Amino acid sequence: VAKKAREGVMEFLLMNHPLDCPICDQGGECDLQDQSMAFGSDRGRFTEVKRSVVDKNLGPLVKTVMTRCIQCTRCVRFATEVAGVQDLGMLGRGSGEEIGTYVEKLLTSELSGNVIDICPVGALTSKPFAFKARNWELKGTETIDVTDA
Amino acid sequence: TEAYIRNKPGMVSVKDMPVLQDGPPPGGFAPVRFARRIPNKGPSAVAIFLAAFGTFSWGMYQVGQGNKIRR
Numbered sequence: 158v159a160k161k162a163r164e165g166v167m168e169f170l171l172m173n174h175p176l177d178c179p180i181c182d183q184g185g186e187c188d189l190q191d192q193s194m195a196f197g198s199d200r201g202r203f204t205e206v207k208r209s210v211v212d213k214n215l216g217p218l219v220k221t222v223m224t225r226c227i228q229c230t231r232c233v234r235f236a237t238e239v240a241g242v243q244d245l246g247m248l249g250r251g252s253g254e255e256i257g258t259y260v261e262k263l264l265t266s267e268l269s270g271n272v273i274d275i276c277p278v279g280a281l282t283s284k285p286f287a288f289k290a291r292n293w294e295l296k297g298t299e300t301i302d303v304t305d306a
Numbered sequence: 307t308e309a310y311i312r313n314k315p316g317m318v319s320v321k322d323m324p325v326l327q328d329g330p331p332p333g334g335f336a337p338v339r340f341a342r343r344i345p346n347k348g349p350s351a352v353a354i355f356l357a358a359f360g361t362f363s364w365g366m367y368q369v370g371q372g373n374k375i376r377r
């Protein structure tokens with residue numbers, strides 16, 4: 158029962174997902190990717206035209222290709238609980254449901270990098286780290302911070 | 307993701323859809339040969355021995371006649 162539930166749900170997501178992994182960074186880090194590879198099926202049965210939306214700008218920190226906004230509301234819940242400023246919001250209906258400030262404003266708050274870490278699928282991504290590297294290429298050293306206190 | 311890619315044109319069900327054209331023609335091309343076969347058809351024993359001995363005797367007779375002439 159649980160196995161088939163997961164298989165079907167992953168089937169629906171990857172059905173109406175875009176198909177641009179080899180340019181979409183977070184490819185190699187993506188939850189949706191690893192979750193599909195480990196728990197979902199292996200073949201898709203779908204031919205018809207998908208849905209696509211226009212990308213969005215949120216200042217020079219978090220660029221978004223909203224073609225892949227899978228309607229999780231992680232960013233919305235973060236921006237309304239931890240950040241403090243209520244700008245992001247989920248608007249629309251049905252398959253035609255986007256996430257974006259309605260008056261093309263920016264996001265004048267900190268923790269927006271935390272937004273780009275929260276958002277699992279690679280849509281909200283750091284602009285100054287646009288396409289410089291995948292994750293499997295670089296090594297991580299665990300340090301502390303000196304800018305803040 | 308397979309139906310029309312494999313074959314779109316006119317099938318009613320997923321079976322009898324494709325045309326493959328991969329392997330051999332009907333018949334196995336031949337029965338082939340694998341066993342060695344080296345025919346032995348040369349003059350076996352007595353032919354070659356008589357040839358050698360007879361040509362030797364006759365060559366000696368010719369040497370005799372020639373040495374007679376030369377003397």
Ligand code: SF4
Pocket residue numbers: 175176177178179181182183184185187189190225277278279280
């Ligand atoms: S975020 Fe989605 S589209 Fe991008 S690499 Fe992952 S699976 Fe591919």
Ligand code: SF4
Pocket residue numbers: 225226227228229230231232233256276277278279280281
């Ligand atoms: S994970 Fe990111 S791109 Fe996907 S629905 Fe949530 S906010 Fe949108």
